[PDB]
Amino acid sequence: SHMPLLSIARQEEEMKEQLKQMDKMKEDLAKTERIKKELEEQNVTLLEQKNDLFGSMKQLEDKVEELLSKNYHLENEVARLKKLVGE
Amino acid sequence: ARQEEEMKEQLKQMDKMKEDLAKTERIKKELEEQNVTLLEQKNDLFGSMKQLEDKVEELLSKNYHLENEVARLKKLVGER
User: Which regions span the lipid bilayer (chain A)?
Assistant: First the structure.
């Protein structure tokens, strides 16, 4: 209250306003902590999932490299065989 | 004076409270940015994953065709 209060009354109004603001902070903290913990857990999971996608990525790049080389060698054999028969 | 002391104690507890909250919010926002960046990196990886799988399927099918073409040609040439 902004009305002119007497010390005895202002004091009581101030103490109530403090407990209130305190409970508000206790609530803001509890919620932020909860959200913080869920974020920790999720990031751990995401990181683990990302490292797995990287691992799969590599296996595939390798598979592609292996197939690209067998492909070129095949096109060269076809060209060699074709020229020999005349196509 | 006695009530003024009760006020001070409440304030010391309050300061500590704001301190724990400020700290918790700072770590939280940090974790949020790390969380969004990871989500995006995971999305990137999926998209690149598909491209590669398609390339593999394509190369595997060309490979088999080429092997059949090489087989056909050898039978004509006499090679074994």
Answer: none
How many Å separate Cα A59 from the centre of its chain? 23
Method by which the model was determined: X-ray
8 Å CB contact between A43 and B36: no
In this structure, which topology does domain A1-87 adopt according to CATH? Answer: 1.20.5
What token pair was written down for B80?
């074994």
For chain A, the structural domain boundaries read 1-87
* B1-80, CATH topology level: 1.20.5
Q: Which residues of chain B have a CB within 8 Å of the CB of A67?
A: 56, 59-60, 63
Contact A46 B69 (CB under 8 A): no
Contact A17, B9 (CB under 8 A): no
CB contact under 8 A, B14 and A35: no
From chain B, the residues in CB contact with A82 under 8 A are: 73
